[PDB]
Design a protein around this ligand. Sequence first.
Ligand SMILES: CCCCCCCCOCCOCCOCCOCCO
Ligand SMILES: CCCCCCCCOCCOCCOCCOCCO
Ligand SMILES: CCCCCCCCOCCOCCOCCOCCO
Ligand SMILES: CCCCCCCCOCCOCCOCCOCCO
Ligand SMILES: CCCCCCCCOCCOCCOCCOCCO
Ligand SMILES: CCCCCCCCOCCOCCOCCOCCO
Lengths: 152, 579
Amino acid sequence: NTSGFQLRGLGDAQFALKEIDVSARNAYGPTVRELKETLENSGVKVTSNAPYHLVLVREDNQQRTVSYTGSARGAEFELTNTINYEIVGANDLVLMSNQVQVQKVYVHDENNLIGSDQEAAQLRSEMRRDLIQQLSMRLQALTPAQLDEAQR
Amino acid sequence: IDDRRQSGFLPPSFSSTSDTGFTLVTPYYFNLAPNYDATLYPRYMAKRGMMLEGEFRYLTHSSEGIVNAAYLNDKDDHREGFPDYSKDRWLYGLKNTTGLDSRWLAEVDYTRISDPYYFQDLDTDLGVGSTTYVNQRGTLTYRGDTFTGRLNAQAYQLATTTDVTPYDRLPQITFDGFLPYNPGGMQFTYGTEFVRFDRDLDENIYFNDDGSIRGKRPDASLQGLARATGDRMHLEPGMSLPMTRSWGYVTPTLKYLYTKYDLDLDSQGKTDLNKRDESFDSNQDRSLPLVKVDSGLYFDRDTTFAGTPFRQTLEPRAMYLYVPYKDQDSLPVFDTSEPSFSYDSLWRENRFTGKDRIGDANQLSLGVTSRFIEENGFERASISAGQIYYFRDRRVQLPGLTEKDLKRLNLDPSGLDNDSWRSPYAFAGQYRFNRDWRINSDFNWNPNTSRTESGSAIFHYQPEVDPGKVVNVGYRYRADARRFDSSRGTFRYGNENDIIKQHDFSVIWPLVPQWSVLARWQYDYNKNRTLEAFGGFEYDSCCWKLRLINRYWLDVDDDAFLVQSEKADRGIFLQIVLK
Ligand SMILES: CCCCCCCCOCCOCCOCCOCCO
Ligand SMILES: CCCCCCCCOCCOCCOCCOCCO
Ligand SMILES: CCCCCCCCOCCOCCOCCOCCO
Ligand SMILES: CCCCCCCCOCCOCCOCCOCCO
Ligand SMILES: CCCCCCCCOCCOCCOCCOCCO
Ligand SMILES: CCCCCCCCOCCOCCOCCOCCO
């Protein structure tokens, strides 16, 4: 009891919003699929019939060189995955909107391109699951009490 | 106002690099754009002739793509003696992606150049570095709710003459799916793959007039199974049973990996080198069980920093991994690479990528992650620390990194221990803020050799939604890189020539109203050499915008003798803009 730390109890990972229509620009893809999967495993059912939708628009996978070899050639690549999500409510009204991103660095080989592509793929999978984790944490903090307060 | 449709000339740009000489570009923006646009880039150069580029872009619901073209009649000369030299420089490629709404995803990533020196002479967009290859791939993907099938035809075109010819995955078919289950029951997964790796080696020596030979392509440095081609089938069924609780989770997983190779050795590889040392088997076989137990706990806490309430979660994680040892030295490497050590390394079923090498395992990976979440669900900070404890050794290594180095290489690089009882300590830190504050750190310390393997400290500074003030400070270190050696035909650990210890500085800052300073400096402490350094001013008038910089940078080069040389250049760059 010196620290103040103690195990998590149901009341924390309760997930207030227990139902939401998860859709994406990439209608069928690893991101959205594993997202709906994680949510369902968390206790939240996913259905097109819903007043509240989580829409994933523009998932972007960027890559840039961040370090260089002794011959001024690419040594390490930095992959940055960025998903732009918006929460939509009644009558196609964008209730809110934000982005979530993550980035990781891997060693690129100029003489082993396919291996580097595999490494990049695995890295993209891990980053994917991390982004889904973050989106989960964000959706958990939501409450149905937060309304549209639309005004025009 | 509209005026997004500038269907006329775009604000031009000048460049005097004292190497490319006077260079004027005068872009034209074809705004046939309800949803798709076009752009023409007529670049005039002094040392070289007049060239033109064409960039088409289209963006719609369920579709996205960019088409690129470029042509130049080479005025500049005396790159004649260089091999694969062309006077008609051209580039054409398609980066497509269709069917994001359907279950049929058609991706395309094609790019064909005229000669390896296209980017080393004409490309200035990617300034500091320069791509040594371009993608020639086409992917068709069906994606059911329960499974996912993919036909992929991927290849690469060398934008250099000093790298080995890349392998082709002419037909890579993958079928990865799961099985419907009920909460409390077992979960079944399966991953199948079939790839035909092929490659057209060009080991033909290039000549002179009096000097006779002057250098041979790197492909002629490949020996034995390094010259191998052929097909590979992988079957990987697996089962998992995740017992999840609100405070912790324990997930046992048992998989089985079966890989079979139908190889071809092109004779020169097998008749000469192999027979000179060992035997060759075109029919190869591998079968391994895999056990993975993943446990973890969840702790919570309530803190308050600067009035802002944060939730500091403590997340300890443990993972046991068992894979029995099988001699895989008789196998060739096609898609396998060995990534350097990090925190993620602790939670991977295999320390290798691809399927050519399955790491012999008997490990207990221990780690922890403390993260700070503000009650809107936002992750503001994250700290991760871990280490792997080895109960056995790591015998399965890449070609040239196993006990080949003991014999046919007589080498023992510093910092390489595969027989120690523990891994380096892995630290991964991250501190974020929405008004674009962002510091990211990574550090890996080997206690056995008492040496730093990998280091990283990246910092991105911005103020209160003011896009004028930006400050980037980065420090990077890397000495555990495992890369294929062109001059040795095998893999190599910690190349003395390619060891990374570099810093990257960048800044944009307001001096006086309508004026701002722009600067950047990349420096390699290993060569004690500056990669890139530019500085200048940006005048932001009420009507126009003027950016002028003095720039010094190194560009990649491969001389007539086919060795990787770095060659620098200084120049003045000017650009106008209306926004
Ligand atoms: C999209 C599949 C392309 C992969 C085919 C293998 C190419 C590997 O060699 C590249 C260099 O060879 C020149 C390519 O040949 C002409 C290409 O243009 C024809 C369009 O398919
Ligand atoms: C005859 C199996 C080899 C040794 C016996 C081990 C018994 C448990 O392992 C069974 C898995 O063996 C792999 C079978 O080959 C792949 C077929 O399953 C893949 C599904 O596509
Ligand atoms: C826990 C550290 C040592 C365990 C290494 C596994 C091999 C020796 O232990 C065998 C007896 O343990 C029972 C089963 O072990 C786990 C399953 O993997 C062993 C394959 O039979
Ligand atoms: C013989 C001279 C030594 C060769 C240059 C090595 C210098 C490396 O250390 C430089 C560290 O000094 C940092 C000062 O920062 C000034 C740059 O910041 C301005 C941003 O462009
Ligand atoms: C450019 C932003 C202002 C910060 C000053 C950094 C200047 C570094 O660029 C120098 C470019 O000259 C290239 C020569 O490299 C250094 C050679 O002298 C070192 C002696 O070993
Ligand atoms: C034709 C160009 C020859 C000049 C040699 C280039 C030297 C490399 O340094 C470029 C940047 O160095 C600082 C010069 O800054 C330009 C003026 O702006 C200064 C305000 O930061």
